[PDB]
Amino acid sequence: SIIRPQLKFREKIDNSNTPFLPKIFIKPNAQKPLPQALSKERRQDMFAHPYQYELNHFTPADAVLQKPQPQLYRPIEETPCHFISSLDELVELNEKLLNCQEFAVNLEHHSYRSFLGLTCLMQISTRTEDFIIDTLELRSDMYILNESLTDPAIVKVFHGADSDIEWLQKDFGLYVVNMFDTHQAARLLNLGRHSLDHLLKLYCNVDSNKQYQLADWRIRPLPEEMLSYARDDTHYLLYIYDKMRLEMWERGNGQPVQLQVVWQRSRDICLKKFIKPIFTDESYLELYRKQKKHLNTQQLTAFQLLFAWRDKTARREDESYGYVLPNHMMLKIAEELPKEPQGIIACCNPVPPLVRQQINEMHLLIQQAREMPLLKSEVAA
Ligand SMILES: [Mg+2]
Numbered sequence: 001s002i003i004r005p006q007l008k009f010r011e012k013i014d015n016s017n018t019p020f021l022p023k024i025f026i027k028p029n030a031q032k033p034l035p036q037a038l039s040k041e042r043r044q045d046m047f048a049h050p051y052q053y054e055l056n057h058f059t060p061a062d063a064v065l066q067k068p069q070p071q072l073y074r075p076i077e078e079t080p081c082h083f084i085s086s087l088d089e090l091v092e093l094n095e096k097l098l099n100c101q102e103f104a105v106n107l108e109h110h111s112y113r114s115f116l117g118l119t120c121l122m123q124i125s126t127r128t129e130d131f132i133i134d135t136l137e138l139r140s141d142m143y144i145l146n147e148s149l150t151d152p153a154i155v156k157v158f159h160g161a162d163s164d165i166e167w168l169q170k171d172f173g174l175y176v177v178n179m180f181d182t183h184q185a186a187r188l189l190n191l192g193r194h195s196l197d198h199l200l201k202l203y204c205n206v207d208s209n210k211q212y213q214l215a216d217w218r219i220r221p222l223p224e225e226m227l228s229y230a231r232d233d234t235h236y237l238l239y240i241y242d243k244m245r246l247e248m249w250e251r252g253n254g255q256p257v258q259l260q261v262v263w264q265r266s267r268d269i270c271l272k273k274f275i276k277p278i279f280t281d282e283s284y285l286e287l288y289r290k291q292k293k294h295l296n297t298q299q300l301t302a303f304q305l306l307f308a309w310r311d312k313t314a315r316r317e318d319e320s321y322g323y324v325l326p327n328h329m330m331l332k333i334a335e336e337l338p339k340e341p342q343g344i345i346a347c348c349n350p351v352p353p354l355v356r357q358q359i360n361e362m363h364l365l366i367q368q369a370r371e372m373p374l375l376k377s378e379v380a381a
C-alpha cells in the first residue's frame with residue numbers, strides 16, 4: 001500500500017472547524033505590507049486575501065496586449081524534463097522563472113485519503129523546459145515560488161485555475177498575480193468545447209490521454225507514464241496562450257478589448273479565497289426528504305450520530321468522508337438500525353477499514369438510537 005504522505009510533514013495539517021488562516025508569512029512583490037500578525041516572527045485585516053490590493057490594482061502591460069507572434073512549442077522529445085524535490089533545486093527554478101516573460105502552471109491533487117485535499121505535484125513549463133515539482137516533499141518550502149507567482153511582470157498561464165488558486169494557498173500559502181486562464185479565453189471566444197483536450201487538438205493536433213485524470217498522485221516513485229501525463233498539461237500551454245491571443249486579436253480587428261477581459265476574468269479567479277468545507281446532515285437529506293422521509297425518530301437519530309461520528313473520525317484521521325463511510329451506507333445503517341455490531345457490517349459492501357476499526361463505538365451509537373421513543377404515528381405507521 002501507499003503510506004500516508006502526511007506523516008512525514010513538518011506541520012500537522014489542521015482541519016478543525018476553525019476558519020482558515022493564510023499560511024503566508026512573507027510577501028514578495030508587495031505594494032501593501034503583510035499584516036504583522038502573519039509574520040513568521042509573531043508565530044489591516046488577517047483572514048483577507050494577502051494580495052487583495054495588488055490584484056485589484058492590476059492590469060496587464062501593453063507589451064502583452066499587442067499583436068502576438070505565436071512561438072511554436074518545443075518538440076516534446078527535444079524538451080528537457082526536470083524533477084524537483086529539494087530546496088536547492090526549487091530555489092534555482094525560481095531564479096529561471098524570474099527571468100521569464102511568461103510560464104505555464106498546473107497542479108495534480110488528491111482528495112480520497114485526505115480531509116481537505118492535498119496538492120501532490122506541481123508542473124511548470126517555460127518556452128524551453130518542463131518541470132515536475134514534488135509538492136509532498138517540498139510542502140514547507142513551496143512558499144518561495146511566491147516571488148515569481150506574484151510578480152506582476154511575468155504572465156502565469158493556467159487552463160481552468162479555479163481549484164489551483166485555492167489549492168495553492170491552502171497547501172503552501174502561494175498566491176498568483178498576473179494570470180491568463182486559457183479556459184476563460186475558450187469561453188470568451190465561444191468555442192465548441194472549453195476543455196484543455198479540445199485546445200490541444202484544435203491548436204496542436206495532440207491527443208490527450210486521461211487514464212490519470214483520477215489516478216492516485218501520492219505514489220512514489222511516479223512511473224514515466226504519469227510524468228509524461230503530468231508534463232503534457234503544461235508543455236503546450238504557452239503556445240495555446242499565443243494562438244488564443246491571436247484569435248482575440250483578429251476578432252477585435254486589431255484591438256486588445258477581448259484580451260483584457262480574459263486578464264480581468266483571470267485576475268478575479270486569483271482573488272478567490274480558500275474556505276474550509278462545512279457539511280451538515282441537513283443537506284444530506286435534501287434528495288431524501290424530497291422523495292420519501294421514512295426516517296422516524298430512531299432512524300433520524302442514528303443518522304445524526306453517525307453523521308457526527310464520520311465528521312469527527314474524518315477530521316481526526318485526515319481522511320475524506322467517502323473513505324470513512326460513504327453516504328449510501330451511512331443512510332442504510334440508519335435505516336436498518338442493526339441490533340448487533342456485525343449487523344452494521346452487513347450494510348457495508350465492502351466494509352471501510354475505519355468502520356471495522358471503530359465498530360463498537362458505532363454500535364453504541366446505533367444502540368442509543370434504538371432507545372429513542374417513537375411517536376404514536378410512528379409505532380402504528
Ligand atoms: Mg488543471
Ligand SMILES: [Y+3]
Pocket residue numbers: 280281282
Ligand atoms: Y442538523
